[PDB]
Design an enzyme around this catalytic site. Structure first.
Site, PDB file in Angstrom:
ATOM      1  N   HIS A  41       0.809  -1.178  -0.111  1.00  0.00           N
ATOM      2  CA  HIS A  41      -0.075   0.194  -0.030  1.00  0.00           C
ATOM      3  C   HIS A  41       0.919   1.294  -0.198  1.00  0.00           C
ATOM      4  O   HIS A  41       0.462   2.128  -0.352  1.00  0.00           O
ATOM      5  CB  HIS A  41      -0.944   0.223   1.337  1.00  0.00           C
ATOM      6  CG  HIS A  41      -2.095  -0.919   1.331  1.00  0.00           C
ATOM      7  ND1 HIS A  41      -2.634  -1.172   0.202  1.00  0.00           N
ATOM      8  CD2 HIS A  41      -2.615  -1.769   2.412  1.00  0.00           C
ATOM      9  CE1 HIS A  41      -3.931  -2.210   0.698  1.00  0.00           C
ATOM     10  NE2 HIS A  41      -3.548  -2.450   1.786  1.00  0.00           N
ATOM     11  N   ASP A  89       0.207  -7.817   1.617  1.00  0.00           N
ATOM     12  CA  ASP A  89       0.717  -6.479   1.598  1.00  0.00           C
ATOM     13  C   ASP A  89       2.018  -6.344   1.674  1.00  0.00           C
ATOM     14  O   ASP A  89       2.707  -5.578   2.655  1.00  0.00           O
ATOM     15  CB  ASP A  89       0.036  -5.785   2.599  1.00  0.00           C
ATOM     16  CG  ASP A  89       0.069  -4.088   2.799  1.00  0.00           C
ATOM     17  OD1 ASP A  89       0.456  -3.786   1.673  1.00  0.00           O
ATOM     18  OD2 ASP A  89      -0.045  -3.508   3.775  1.00  0.00           O
ATOM     19  N   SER A 183       3.973   2.104   8.800  1.00  0.00           N
ATOM     20  CA  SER A 183       3.602   1.112   7.737  1.00  0.00           C
ATOM     21  C   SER A 183       4.981   0.402   6.957  1.00  0.00           C
ATOM     22  O   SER A 183       5.764   1.186   6.682  1.00  0.00           O
ATOM     23  CB  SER A 183       2.637   1.438   6.885  1.00  0.00           C
ATOM     24  OG  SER A 183       1.621   1.901   7.322  1.00  0.00           O
ATOM     25  N   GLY A 184       5.183  -0.838   6.615  1.00  0.00           N
ATOM     26  CA  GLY A 184       6.015  -1.161   6.004  1.00  0.00           C
ATOM     27  C   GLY A 184       7.393  -1.751   6.889  1.00  0.00           C
ATOM     28  O   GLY A 184       8.467  -2.290   6.312  1.00  0.00           O
TER      29      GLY A 184
HETATM   30  C1  LIG Z   1      -1.343   2.420  11.401  1.00  0.00           C
HETATM   31  N1  LIG Z   1      -1.577   3.092  10.446  1.00  0.00           N
HETATM   32  C2  LIG Z   1      -0.829   2.786   9.180  1.00  0.00           C
HETATM   33  C3  LIG Z   1      -1.193   3.607   8.188  1.00  0.00           C
HETATM   34  N2  LIG Z   1      -0.907   3.720   6.952  1.00  0.00           N
HETATM   35  C4  LIG Z   1       0.263   4.383   6.311  1.00  0.00           C
HETATM   36  O1  LIG Z   1       1.234   4.650   7.265  1.00  0.00           O
HETATM   37  N3  LIG Z   1       0.456   4.437   5.042  1.00  0.00           N
HETATM   38  C5  LIG Z   1      -0.388   3.835   4.041  1.00  0.00           C
HETATM   39  C6  LIG Z   1       0.854   3.959   2.889  1.00  0.00           C
HETATM   40  C7  LIG Z   1       1.649   4.988   3.063  1.00  0.00           C
HETATM   41  C8  LIG Z   1       1.808   5.134   4.599  1.00  0.00           C
HETATM   42  C9  LIG Z   1       1.505   6.585   4.890  1.00  0.00           C
HETATM   43  O2  LIG Z   1       0.637   7.220   5.144  1.00  0.00           O
HETATM   44  N4  LIG Z   1       2.808   7.403   4.992  1.00  0.00           N
HETATM   45  C10 LIG Z   1       3.070   8.898   5.236  1.00  0.00           C
HETATM   46  C11 LIG Z   1       2.229   9.537   4.889  1.00  0.00           C
HETATM   47  C12 LIG Z   1       2.422  11.095   5.114  1.00  0.00           C
HETATM   48  C13 LIG Z   1       3.327  11.388   5.997  1.00  0.00           C
HETATM   49  C14 LIG Z   1       4.166  10.268   6.580  1.00  0.00           C
HETATM   50  O3  LIG Z   1       5.324  10.553   7.236  1.00  0.00           O
HETATM   51  C15 LIG Z   1       4.815  10.682   8.831  1.00  0.00           C
HETATM   52  F1  LIG Z   1       4.920   9.657   9.192  1.00  0.00           F
HETATM   53  F2  LIG Z   1       4.054  11.479   9.261  1.00  0.00           F
HETATM   54  F3  LIG Z   1       6.282  11.023   9.273  1.00  0.00           F
HETATM   55  C16 LIG Z   1       4.137   8.955   6.313  1.00  0.00           C
HETATM   56  C17 LIG Z   1      -1.987   4.787   8.808  1.00  0.00           C
HETATM   57  C18 LIG Z   1      -2.890   5.795   8.318  1.00  0.00           C
HETATM   58  C19 LIG Z   1      -3.305   6.762   9.313  1.00  0.00           C
HETATM   59  C20 LIG Z   1      -3.729   6.146  10.734  1.00  0.00           C
HETATM   60  C21 LIG Z   1      -3.139   4.917  11.144  1.00  0.00           C
HETATM   61  C22 LIG Z   1      -2.117   4.137  10.213  1.00  0.00           C
END
Ligand SMILES: Cn1cc(NC(=O)N2CCC[C@H]2C(=O)Nc2cccc(OC(F)(F)F)c2)c2ccccc21
Length: 228
Positions: A41, A89, A183-184
């Site tokens: 994802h 995933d 994530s990841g």
């Molecule tokens: C457990 N949990 C997991 C989620 N999903 C998730 O993290 N992602 C889905 C795939 C991409 C990744 C992501 O959104 N990355 C991202 C986006 C923007 C900034 C950022 O930097 C950061 F972390 F803020 F420092 C990272 C997720 C989303 C919301 C709530 C809980 C959530």
């Protein structure tokens, strides 16, 4: 990471930041000299954005001798992954060249024996994801130790209501948890990679919604096929 602490700099030399257009997006884990494992994802609607992998890092912003940003030759999502599911995933990223290895950059051994981690086992998860409900982003790597949660509990209607297949595992989420941006990343048990944080949006730090991790051992042959 919620409820964690700043990690010891460079003590997890397998830890990767998967970046999109120069910003941290997801965690990942160096599993071979030229390959980083993350979640599928992560690259959803990444389109033709620049995907890179930062190795050897503690701080996202500050210069460090071991830090290097690698380009990505190939991004290989699992063929059975889908936007609306938590299944399969996984993502493999082929770096443009083999990583320069040293004390701060080293692949992590990963589990190929397909047997569940015992409930209660304390495992480590690290990341640069948000550290509070406001969404504060840490500059440096954070981590937390989490006990594995048995699959039956995780599958209760109150929890994840049957969604946890044999290919997935759970960890407790009571105040201490992975969160957005984690994530990841790797769930490490006894020095061996066992899980990859799933990348579905999930409330963080609520005991009733445990963390979900893809079991790498369940995908051993796929990991092997992609590298070949
Ligand atoms: C457990 N949990 C997991 C989620 N999903 C998730 O993290 N992602 C889905 C795939 C991409 C990744 C992501 O959104 N990355 C991202 C986006 C923007 C900034 C950022 O930097 C950061 F972390 F803020 F420092 C990272 C997720 C989303 C919301 C709530 C809980 C959530």
């Amino acid at each position: 990471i919620l409820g964690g602490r700043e990690a010891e700099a460079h003590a997890r030399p397998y830890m990767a930041s998967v970046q999109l257009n120069g910003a941290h997006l997801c965690g990942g884990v160096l599993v071979a000299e030229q390959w980083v494992l993350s979640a599928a994802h992560c690259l959803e609607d990444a389109a033709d954005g620049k995907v890179q992998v930062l190795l050897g890092a503690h701080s996202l912003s500050q210069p460090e001798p071991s830090k290097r940003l690698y380009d990505v030759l190939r991004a290989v999502p699992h063929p059975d992954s889908q936007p609306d599911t938590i299944d399969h995933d996984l993502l493999l990223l082929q770096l443009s060249e083999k990583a320069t290895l040293g004390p701060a950059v080293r692949p992590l051994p990963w589990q190929r024996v397909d047997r569940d981690v015992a409930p209660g086992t304390l495992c480590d998860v690290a990341g640069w994801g948000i550290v509070n409900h406001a969404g504060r982003r840490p500059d440096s790597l954070q981590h937390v130790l989490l006990p594995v949660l048995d699959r039956a509990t995780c599958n209760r209607r109150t929890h994840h209501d049957g969604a946890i297949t044999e290919r997935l595992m759970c960890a407790e989420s009571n105040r201490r948890d992975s969160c957005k941006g984690d994530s990841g990343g790797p769930l490490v048990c006894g020095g061996v990679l066992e899980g990859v944080v799933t990348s579905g949006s999930r409330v963080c730090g609520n005991r009733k919604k445990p963390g979900i991790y893809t079991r790498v051992a369940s995908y051993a042959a796929w990991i092997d096929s992609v590298l070949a």
